[PDB]
Amino acid sequence: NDAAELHNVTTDLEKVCRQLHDPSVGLSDISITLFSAFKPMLAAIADIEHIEKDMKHQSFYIETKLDGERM
DNA sequence: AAAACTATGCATGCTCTACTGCTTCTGATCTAGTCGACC
Numbered sequence A: 001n002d003a004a005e006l007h008n009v010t011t012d013l014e015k016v017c018r019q020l021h022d023p024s025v026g027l028s029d030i031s032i033t034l035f036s037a038f039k040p041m042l043a044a045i046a047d048i049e050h051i052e053k054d055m056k057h058q059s060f061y062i063e064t065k066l067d068g069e070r071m
Numbered sequence B: 001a002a003a004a005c006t007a008t009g010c011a012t013g014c015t016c017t018a019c020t021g022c023t024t025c026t027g028a029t030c031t032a033g034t035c036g037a038c039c
């Protein structure tokens, strides 16, 4: 039931298959752990007209986009 | 004076050791292409 969630945090099939061996027994809490790769949060295209509606009519942060690798 | 034994030179074959030329193997180099991973 909770395997995609664990893989989004560990990115290691071995841990997913070992920890989640019994379907009945789940994982109490799954979160980013040290020395375990986590799938980075990505960004979606924006239509400038509705930008405010996308920010729930509140303040937002503007930053520059950098041309390089993600680490 | 005549005959028998021996010495030395030379021809002859076979065997062994350098030098030139052809063929093949290795090393080194360059050029073209593939793959990982990102975006």
Ligand SMILES: *OP(=O)(O)OC[C@H]1O[C@@H](n2cnc3c(N)ncnc32)[C@H](O)[C@@H]1O
Pocket: A042, A043, A063, A064, A065, A066, A067, A068, A069, A070
């Ligand atoms: O087009 P895309 O989906 O790759 O864009 C997202 C990527 O953009 C890079 N990036 C650069 N600067 C930022 C900031 N400030 N925040 C988030 N992402 C940023 C990342 O590499 C990202 O995956």
Ligand SMILES: [Mg+2]
Pocket: A066, A067, A068, A069, B039
């Ligand atoms: Mg980028």
